[PDB]
Amino acid sequence: RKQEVPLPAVGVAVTGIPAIERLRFKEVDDEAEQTLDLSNHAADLTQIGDDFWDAFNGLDREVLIQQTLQLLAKENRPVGLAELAELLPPAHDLETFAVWIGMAREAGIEVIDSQREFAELSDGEGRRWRFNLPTTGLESQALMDIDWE
Amino acid sequence: MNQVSGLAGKESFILTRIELFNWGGFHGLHQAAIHQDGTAVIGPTGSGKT
Amino acid sequence: QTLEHWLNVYHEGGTRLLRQMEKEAIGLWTYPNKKQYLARLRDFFEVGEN
Amino acid sequence: MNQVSGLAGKESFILTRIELFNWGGFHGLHQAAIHQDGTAVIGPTGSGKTTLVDALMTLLLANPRYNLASTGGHESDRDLISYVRGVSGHIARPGKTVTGIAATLEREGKQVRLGALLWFDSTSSSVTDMKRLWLFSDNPGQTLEHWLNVYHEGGTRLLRQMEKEAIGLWTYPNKKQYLARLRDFFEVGENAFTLLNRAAGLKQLNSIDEIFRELVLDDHSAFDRAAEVANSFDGLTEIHQ
Amino acid sequence: LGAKALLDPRFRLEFAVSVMDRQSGNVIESRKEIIASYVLTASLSYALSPAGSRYPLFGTIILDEAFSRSSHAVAGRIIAALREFGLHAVFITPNKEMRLLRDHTRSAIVVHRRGQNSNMASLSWEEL
Amino acid sequence: FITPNKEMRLLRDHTRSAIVVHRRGQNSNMASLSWEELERHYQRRGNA
Amino acid sequence: LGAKALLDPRFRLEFAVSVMDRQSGNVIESRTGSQGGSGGEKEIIASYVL
Amino acid sequence: IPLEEAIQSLSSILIEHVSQEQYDINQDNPFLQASRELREWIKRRLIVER
Ligand SMILES: Nc1ncnc2c1ncn2[C@@H]1O[C@H](COP(=O)(O)OP(=O)(O)O)[C@@H](O)[C@H]1O
Ligand SMILES: Nc1ncnc2c1ncn2[C@@H]1O[C@H](COP(=O)(O)OP(=O)(O)O)[C@@H](O)[C@H]1O
């Protein structure tokens, strides 16, 4: 395999005339060390906005649903939304009202939007409000016939 | 809810800690354990989870 | 062995030291090409690439 | 927060009310209200909110991108005929079915109303089997359920006859002329309602440039011209060769 | 993107936005979320304003999923800007970030769908 | 479980830890917390 | 779709999941195709299969 | 067998046979032994790789 064939020398390249001048030398003068970083970056969570802690603090439909069922077992009668607010004043009012109407309609019970009832609720900063609510009635029977998942 | 987790850690290997360095936006050294009952990565959207 | 240890060793010495560490150590292996490491993994975890 | 909202109504027309009848899942008459200082529609995922959005939008464009938001690029499984039929995936209203829609507004305390009355007289659902009308009123003495009763008295000719009976009332069998009348009543070019459609399904704000492109400006890209450009060039190539 | 650069008028130019000092008109910024919402409200209001009209004559705007994809401050800026443009606004959300909207809205309509049936229940409130 | 901010409510109950990640413009951090400690951190933020 | 339907093995097969009764060979209910708006069951079935 | 998987499995196997006192005991690098012997068996045309 490694026999030397007699072919002509074509494309004959000449390079690397060893002129002494072409030499240069290790420039170790770049002495600056690259510092090490082994620091544990312990982090404080207070730098991310309230958009996260709010979802942390949000309402849970399960807990409120069970609380309302307990209340309706206690009263054992049809009850309107304003009475539900008075008996169980919430913290996240509008969402709780929406959940209450959601149960009302999960029971198939009519919510007469055309006739109203009212209530007043304070909030987390002492400010007070009024709620124009629709007329309907929740029943322990209604929400035990219905089930939750 | 949380009572079913006896099996984990007896038969299989379980990820329990990921250490990173100069990876993505995680400048410098970072470390986070994973509880063998199931752990969840939480954070503001667009905060290096993926 | 931990990521901290490996990074510290690498800073203390370049790739030469990193490849030399394996033979000094025990229960450790290195793979300057990935597919070798992935074969080691799949063997250890008895599962195909799928 | 909202005490500066005194300009609404006093300065411009704003939405006040909506009504529905045999539309989507809303079997029979169904209603809602709107507050001057603003309102929000809420409910569990997939409960009829974007359905109401589309029901409103049907009256304000040549055609809106029905179900624009939740599709995420998916084709409009929802449209006029399916809504009148109440489709899901089992048609809610087959055979002969009737339907009605409306919206309401106010300026200086004086009311405005839009609406349209639809019905198939047969189980088939061709675009022409649909008998349709549109409406516009600048008088408080008009409401959707009253229009449904009027239709129960007779066909489209009756909806036009009550238009002739009252003043400040308009109705039309063709969507374009009704749209033109309303647009003249507001000096609004239809590109404004096109932009309204762009906004009414916009998801998270991606970037200001892409937002200009996809919301502020109509596409109107000239790819339609490229086709006939290529065809005419090939035609010239034939003779040249 | 090249076909857009050739056939799409919108791609022939790159859009920009600059923050201005009201008095002197000096540039403070030459360039996201906080500004894009104002941009969109501006565009609709102008498109809905007849020629020679200070206000948008049709001053109602709809936003699907308006704030189920935005931070609290972002939606606050949205409502503020809507006030700056004199635009009544409507919003939609699947029962999320409700604290904001309850704070910044005075009515709502809940919709729940029982199988093939749907219905509506309106509500309202105010501060004292 | 990788989770967005929404629906974190349900997930809180059915797990025992959380890896909280941080965005700081062009930088990020990450820490290991249990729900017990994250609740106290929320309270500390509420107080300060 | 046509080309894959010919030259890709796993495209010649439609897949469906049928719930079985432990005490009977019958099918309680089968899940596949377009649900039309309700997916409270499809989600869990697909997650379970994966 | 993919070649890398094969060499890893063969190294694992040869680790077992380190106890055979009369056959080429390696206790410094069984991985290199496995590689060399796979190459040798390829030389004998026992195993052909494509
Ligand atoms: N192509 C990119 N575009 C935007 N940010 C990027 C990109 N690549 C890396 N980043 C950086 O790494 C992160 C990638 O996005 P990320 O936040 O991890 O996704 P998510 O938050 O949805 O899980 C960004 O937060 C950013 O810091
Ligand atoms: N015209 C239609 N075509 C197909 N599906 C429809 C149609 N109308 C209503 N639906 C159903 O009615 C429900 C509408 O709920 P909606 O809240 O408006 O949608 P999303 O929450 O996804 O934005 C959905 O379950 C939808 O499937």
Side-chain angles (χ1 to χ4, degrees):
Chain A
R1 274 153 54 205
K2 299 180 78 78
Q3 267 286 5
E4 304 182 318
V5 188
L7 258 63
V10 299
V12 176
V14 170
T15 198
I17 290 296
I20 191 70
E21 186 279 359
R22 86 197 195 277
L23 300 176
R24 294 200 292 223
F25 316 96
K26 172 69 77 171
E27 286 174 33
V28 69
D29 307 58
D30 188 11
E31 189 65 38
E33 175 185 46
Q34 306 85 64
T35 57
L36 259 176
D37 178 8
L38 321 183
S39 69
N40 287 305
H41 275 57
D44 189 357
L45 294 74
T46 59
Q47 288 63 19
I48 55 172
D50 289 334
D51 39 40
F52 163 56
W53 309 94
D54 283 350
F56 197 83
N57 304 153
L59 191 83
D60 162 42
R61 93 169 196 148
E62 177 57 30
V63 158
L64 181 137
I65 281 284
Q66 292 307 333
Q67 284 193 347
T68 47
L69 255 295
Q70 298 342 304
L71 173 34
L72 287 163
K74 145 64 61 180
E75 288 300 293
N76 201 22
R77 68 190 173 86
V79 295
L81 280 292
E83 308 105 285
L84 290 177
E86 293 207 343
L87 299 156
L88 287 174
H92 310 109
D93 50 357
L94 185 47
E95 309 80 10
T96 53
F97 282 118
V99 168
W100 287 341
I101 306 143
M103 313 136 50
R105 300 197 293 199
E106 188 67 20
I109 293 171
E110 166 52 35
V111 52
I112 306 92
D113 210 28
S114 53
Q115 65 205 23
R116 314 301 297 184
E117 53 215 43
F118 303 89
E120 283 78 20
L121 279 75
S122 60
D123 61 13
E125 59 178 309
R127 166 184 55 222
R128 205 172 70 257
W129 304 73
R130 175 175 169 103
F131 270 69
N132 190 341
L133 278 203
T135 293
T136 188
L138 303 203
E139 244 286 350
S140 192
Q141 150 277 323
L143 309 186
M144 55 218 275
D145 293 348
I146 271 56
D147 258 15
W148 312 98
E149 265 205 307
Chain B
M1 294 306 197
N2 305 318
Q3 289 82 12
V4 194
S5 318
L7 173 55
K10 92 185 211 192
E11 298 307 328
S12 75
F13 288 92
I14 284 291
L15 206 185
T16 59
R17 147 181 306 280
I18 313 176
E19 301 154 45
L20 263 63
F21 189 89
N22 276 332
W23 174 265
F26 302 101
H27 303 179
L29 207 150
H30 307 251
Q31 310 193 38
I34 291 288
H35 195 274
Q36 78 251 15
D37 191 3
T39 299
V41 184
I42 66 183
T45 301
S47 190
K49 314 190 307 312
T50 307
Chain C
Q1 306 301 326
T2 63
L3 194 69
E4 164 280 332
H5 182 68
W6 302 330
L7 289 166
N8 176 50
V9 167
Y10 169 78
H11 183 272
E12 181 170 341
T15 78
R16 190 200 66 71
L17 173 55
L18 277 179
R19 275 289 310 104
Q20 174 164 316
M21 75 195 287
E22 169 185 307
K23 297 173 174 70
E24 310 179 0
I26 176 61
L28 171 65
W29 301 269
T30 68
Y31 303 87
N33 92 78
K34 191 176 195 165
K35 304 191 311 312
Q36 221 154 24
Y37 167 82
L38 266 46
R40 178 66 163 132
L41 183 80
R42 285 192 304 270
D43 169 31
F44 188 96
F45 281 98
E46 308 189 41
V47 287
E49 198 46 13
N50 172 39
Chain D
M1 291 173 290
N2 294 63
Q3 262 75 349
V4 178
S5 180
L7 293 315
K10 200 165 67 72
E11 308 301 300
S12 53
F13 297 76
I14 64 95
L15 170 56
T16 54
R17 218 168 194 281
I18 292 171
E19 293 101 46
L20 256 193
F21 178 84
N22 287 350
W23 177 274
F26 297 99
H27 316 298
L29 196 77
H30 292 278
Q31 313 180 21
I34 296 95
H35 196 291
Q36 174 194 252
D37 300 346
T39 178
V41 187
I42 55 183
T45 302
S47 53
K49 61 211 213 300
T50 67
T51 294
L52 188 67
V53 173
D54 270 5
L56 154 55
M57 281 295 268
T58 289
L59 301 176
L60 283 306
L61 285 98
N63 261 312
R65 272 270 81 202
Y66 295 85
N67 205 23
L68 174 57
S70 296
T71 47
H74 192 277
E75 189 59 290
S76 69
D77 185 32
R78 325 193 185 168
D79 53 12
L80 174 56
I81 69 175
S82 62
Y83 273 124
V84 167
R85 295 298 191 190
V87 178
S88 59
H90 61 276
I91 288 168
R93 288 180 292 278
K96 165 160 187 184
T97 181
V98 180
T99 295
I101 60 173
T104 321
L105 295 98
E106 163 271 292
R107 173 88 187 294
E108 316 195 35
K110 213 251 276 184
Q111 190 159 124
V112 161
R113 190 174 244 93
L114 288 52
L117 284 313
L118 301 313
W119 73 90
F120 295 103
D121 60 5
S122 172
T123 202
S124 166
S125 305
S126 179
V127 300
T128 43
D129 295 339
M130 180 45 88
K131 323 302 184 179
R132 62 175 64 75
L133 196 86
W134 321 87
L135 302 92
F136 153 58
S137 177
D138 197 23
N139 195 323
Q142 303 304 325
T143 60
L144 179 58
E145 42 73 24
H146 143 79
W147 295 337
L148 314 165
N149 295 349
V150 168
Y151 167 76
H152 292 309
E153 312 312 334
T156 60
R157 291 165 283 97
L158 276 75
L159 292 173
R160 289 273 282 198
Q161 175 55 26
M162 320 329 141
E163 181 197 330
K164 321 315 303 178
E165 289 170 2
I167 184 58
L169 179 51
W170 293 262
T171 64
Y172 308 86
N174 49 13
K175 199 181 190 182
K176 287 303 306 189
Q177 151 185 230
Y178 148 74
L179 292 163
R181 170 54 188 133
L182 180 71
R183 278 169 44 218
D184 161 65
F185 181 63
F186 292 127
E187 307 195 54
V188 164
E190 211 149 316
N191 70 308
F193 293 147
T194 302
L195 176 59
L196 187 166
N197 172 63
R198 305 306 293 189
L202 172 55
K203 216 171 166 264
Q204 70 294 314
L205 303 157
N206 296 343
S207 173
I208 64 149
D209 298 2
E210 162 272 359
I211 280 163
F212 274 41
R213 304 177 197 214
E214 283 188 350
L215 296 303
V216 179
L217 326 161
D218 196 15
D219 35 22
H220 179 57
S221 60
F223 295 92
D224 55 354
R225 305 303 311 289
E228 61 179 24
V229 154
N231 314 327
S232 62
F233 184 91
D234 286 340
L236 210 174
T237 299
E238 292 297 327
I239 310 305
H240 165 273
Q241 287 320 122
Chain E
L1 53 97
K4 307 288 294 285
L6 255 60
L7 272 288
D8 185 358
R10 309 170 305 155
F11 276 66
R12 296 302 197 87
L13 78 184
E14 185 277 355
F15 305 86
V17 179
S18 301
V19 182
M20 291 334 306
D21 185 5
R22 168 54 76 187
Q23 282 44 52
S24 71
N26 275 295
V27 178
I28 306 92
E29 312 189 47
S30 191
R31 194 71 183 161
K32 304 184 293 173
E33 66 281 354
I34 287 173
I35 318 85
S37 48
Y38 193 93
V39 160
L40 218 193
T41 36
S43 65
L44 301 134
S45 62
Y46 160 84
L48 292 166
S49 78
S53 179
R54 185 265 179 278
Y55 311 97
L57 186 57
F58 193 84
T60 287
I61 157 166
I62 313 300
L63 287 97
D64 159 279
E65 300 291 337
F67 310 119
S68 71
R69 75 306 190 90
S70 59
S71 175
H72 173 96
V74 176
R77 280 295 307 193
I78 277 160
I79 175 59
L82 288 156
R83 204 59 43 245
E84 305 299 347
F85 288 112
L87 275 178
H88 161 275
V90 176
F91 313 109
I92 326 288
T93 171
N95 184 53
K96 288 168 171 58
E97 187 33 275
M98 290 338 314
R99 295 81 46 193
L100 203 27
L101 323 187
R102 159 56 176 74
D103 301 348
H104 289 87
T105 68
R106 303 320 180 242
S107 83
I109 165 56
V110 184
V111 184
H112 187 59
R113 218 177 81 98
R114 210 71 179 86
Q116 194 145 27
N117 199 9
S118 65
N119 95 316
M120 269 183 234
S122 310
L123 296 94
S124 174
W125 64 95
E126 54 266 10
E127 64 193 62
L128 302 169
Chain F
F1 307 118
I2 315 303
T3 183
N5 300 348
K6 57 157 278 295
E7 262 206 18
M8 181 186 338
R9 189 59 143 89
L10 73 90
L11 175 169
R12 201 165 92 242
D13 295 347
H14 307 84
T15 68
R16 308 304 296 287
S17 169
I19 284 177
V20 62
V21 285
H22 284 13
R23 189 72 191 290
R24 194 159 295 186
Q26 307 305 332
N27 177 90
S28 288
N29 286 49
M30 96 160 194
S32 55
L33 287 296
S34 184
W35 299 124
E36 328 312 9
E37 294 157 290
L38 185 49
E39 173 55 30
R40 280 182 284 164
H41 264 286
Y42 162 59
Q43 292 304 342
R44 285 162 190 152
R45 174 167 178 73
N47 287 359
Chain G
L1 176 45
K4 285 176 293 192
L6 262 82
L7 309 210
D8 174 348
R10 65 213 197 263
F11 267 84
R12 300 210 192 181
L13 294 176
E14 291 190 325
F15 300 79
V17 174
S18 295
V19 187
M20 289 303 113
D21 186 1
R22 270 285 200 200
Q23 309 190 24
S24 183
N26 283 357
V27 51
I28 300 286
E29 168 72 328
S30 68
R31 263 288 179 252
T32 195
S34 54
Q35 304 301 297
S38 298
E41 309 82 14
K42 200 188 160 64
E43 296 315 75
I44 185 271
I45 297 309
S47 185
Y48 188 86
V49 161
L50 168 56
Chain H
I1 316 305
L3 187 142
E4 188 33 47
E5 196 130 53
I7 193 271
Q8 182 52 32
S9 198
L10 172 58
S11 72
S12 83
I13 274 175
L14 196 141
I15 283 161
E16 303 273 2
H17 294 151
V18 303
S19 46
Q20 313 312 83
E21 68 190 332
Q22 80 275 73
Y23 290 124
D24 189 21
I25 304 100
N26 174 288
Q27 196 150 20
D28 49 38
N29 192 333
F31 192 95
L32 195 63
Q33 203 76 330
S35 178
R36 288 158 65 170
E37 291 216 60
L38 259 206
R39 261 146 35 101
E40 284 299 326
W41 303 342
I42 278 175
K43 203 158 78 76
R44 265 82 169 285
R45 272 84 167 288
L46 292 181
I47 41 157
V48 86
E49 71 82 19
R50 305 175 287 99

